[PDB]
Every structure is written in structure tokens, then in C-alpha cells.
Amino acid sequence: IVGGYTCGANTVPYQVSLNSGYHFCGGSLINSQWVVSAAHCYKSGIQVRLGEDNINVVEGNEQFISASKSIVHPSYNSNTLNNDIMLIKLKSAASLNSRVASISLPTSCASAGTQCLISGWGNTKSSGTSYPDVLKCLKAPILSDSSCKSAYPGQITSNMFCAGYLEGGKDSCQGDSGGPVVCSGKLQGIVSWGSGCAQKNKPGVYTKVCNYVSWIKQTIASN
Ligand SMILES: N=C(N)c1ccc(CNC(=O)[C@@H]2CCN2C(=O)[C@H](NCC(=O)O)C2CCCCC2)cc1
Ligand SMILES: [Ca+2]
Numbered sequence: 001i002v003g004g005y006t007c008g009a010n011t012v013p014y015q016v017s018l019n020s021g022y023h024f025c026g027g028s029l030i031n032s033q034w035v036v037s038a039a040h041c042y043k044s045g046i047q048v049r050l051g052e053d054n055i056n057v058v059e060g061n062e063q064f065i066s067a068s069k070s071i072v073h074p075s076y077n078s079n080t081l082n083n084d085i086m087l088i089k090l091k092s093a094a095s096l097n098s099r100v101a102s103i104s105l106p107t108s109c110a111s112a113g114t115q116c117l118i119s120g121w122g123n124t125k126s127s128g129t130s131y132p133d134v135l136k137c138l139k140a141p142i143l144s145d146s147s148c149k150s151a152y153p154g155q156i157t158s159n160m161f162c163a164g165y166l167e168g169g170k171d172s173c174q175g176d177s178g179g180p181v182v183c184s185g186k187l188q189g190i191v192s193w194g195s196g197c198a199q200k201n202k203p204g205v206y207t208k209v210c211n212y213v214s215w216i217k218q219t220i221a222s223n
Helices: 145-151 213-221
Strands: 015-019 023-031 034-037 047-050 063-072 086-090 115-120 136-141 160-163 180-183 186-193 204-208
Touching (some): 023 047, 034 186, 160 186
Antiparallel strands (some): 015 023, 115 136, 180 186, 186 204
């Protein structure tokens, strides 16, 4: 997260860290046994870390659970990042409490102008490299489709939406991948892609979760 602020220990209870010996992507807990992340985060040998704040220090509220199975969206395209969504099932149910909670799926897609909260442990430099150990947060609005498409001609599909600031300075970045974009108490997006980080006229692109609610519900009910 570039140009954001420290969330504060466990203020974003649904945030998860995907770990393969180190943090490599974020994710969202949707219920006690399932995590939603981005397809481009796909990897074998994943441990899901819940109740995390400082990822390098055991503070006492963590739950480390291995993934039993991963399901990448059937139509995921690794070249364009269309349908960048993946589901991860935990080997055992996580204990839900104040510091570890699930986020609700959307009943509809949010409108442009809606303010959202994006969070992650990714890079904090627009031109450089500096990774934080505590969770970072950023409030950002969903941009109009025109602004989004003007920025990335011929690359935006109906399964994507832009969020952030066209002036730059504030944006998600590498390391935040798979993380949540919550607006009005619902999971509206997943940190997917962009051009560099926090660059002028290059806003962040996110997976539009509202289009996948049916797939999510049917898939988890059958696995
Ligand atoms: N909001 C942001 N600024 C932002 C947030 C998270 C990320 C991390 N995600 C990635 O790196 C994923 C896998 C490759 N892809 C990219 O972002 C690529 N650009 C890479 C680039 O131009 O930096 C995109 C460019 C557009 C065609 C698909 C590949 C990148 C940017
Ligand atoms: Ca910790």
C-alpha cells in the first residue's frame, strides 16, 4: 500500500496472509473454512495466516491453517488477468472471534464514487522497495468505467473495475495481491493488477466480485 496508513492491530479481521515460507499474497476470509484470493496468487503448499498484524512477530492472535484445496476460476486468463479469482479451502475451520472474522459477499455491484477500504502488506514505495511488517490501509473510491478504460485502452473487461486516484500518490502495490477491497461492509473487489504503483493516470485494477457470487456459492457448497 502506497500513501496509506497503519490500520492498527486486528482492525481488519477478515484480512489473511498467504504464506509459503514468507508472505506472498493477501486474501479474505468469507466463512470459517474458505478464503477468496486472486488467481495470479496461485501456488502449491500454502499456509493461511489469520489474525495477523505484524507478519514477522507472533503477537498471540494468529491462527495458522494449511490449505486443503485451491480452485482457480475456470475461465482465468493469465495473460490479461480476466477472471482473476481463486478459492482456498482450509484443512480445518478457523475459530471466529473479534480478531478473526469473515466478510460478506455483495448482493449487487457498487456504484462509482463509493468509498472502499483496501489493505495489505505490500510495497509502500511508488518508486522503490520497502515492505512493511504491519498491515497498511487505504481509503479509495471506485472510479467511473470511462476513467478506468481511458487509462487502459482495450484491457478492461466487465469483470474488472478501477479504484484509487488518477493524481497518483495512493494505490495498492505488489504484495497486496489477492487482498480485499471492502465498500459498504461488502467484499467488492480483489487486488489484481495495474501499471507500476501510485503513478499518475494509472489507477489500480480490481476483480469485480459481484459477478462471481453465484460461482463462489455453488463451488463452496460442492467442495
Ligand atoms: N494497484 C496497483 N498499482 C497494483 C496492485 C497490485 C499489483 C500486482 N499484480 C501484478 O503484478 C499482476 C501479475 C502481473 N499483473 C500485473 O499487474 C501486470 N502489470 C505489472 C506492472 O505494470 O507493474 C498486468 C499488466 C496488464 C495486463 C496483465 C498483466 C500491481 C499493481
Ligand atoms: Ca504476527
